[PDB]
Amino acid sequence: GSSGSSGSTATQKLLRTDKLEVCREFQRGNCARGETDCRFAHPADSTMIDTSDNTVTVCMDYIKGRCMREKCKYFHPPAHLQAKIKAAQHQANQAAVA
């Protein structure tokens, strides 16, 4: 076979929704809005963080309201947030801009 047509651009082609951008301030302890008034998730453990993208996985089950996965090892976002994501899946209208 070809075994590699071409690698001009080094980047995959896909998109996920279970990815929360970890805050930069909180990490050091500067964020005042907190995971509550802050859109970015605040990892308390700060262990499942990738220094490559700086994003944490999102528990799909939990989002639905029932999280009983096997040894759930994903971040659990707050209520306000949990929704922000849900809406995305369920076709709906968007609010104005800030």
Binding site for Zn ion (CB under 5 A): 23, 26, 31, 38, 40, 59, 62, 67, 72
Name the DSSP letter for residue 20: E
Q: In the bound complex, what is the minimum distance in angstroms from residue 93's beta carbon to Zn ion? A: 27
Can you give the length of the chain in residues? 98
Q: Which amino acid appears at position 26 of this protein?
A: F
Q: Which is nearer to Zn ion, 49 or 59 (CB)?
A: 59
Q: Which is nearer to Zn ion, 47 or 93 (CB)?
A: 47
Q: In the bound complex, what is the minimum distance in angstroms from residue 60's beta carbon to Zn ion? A: 8
Q: In the bound complex, what is the minimum distance in angstroms from residue 57's beta carbon to Zn ion? A: 10
Gap between the Cα atoms of 25 and 33, Å rounded = 10
Please, are residues 56 and 73 in contact by the beta-carbon 8 Å criterion? no
- Among 66, 89, 88, 62, smallest CA distance to 74 is for 62
Q: Which is nearer to Zn ion, 28 or 90 (CB)?
A: 28
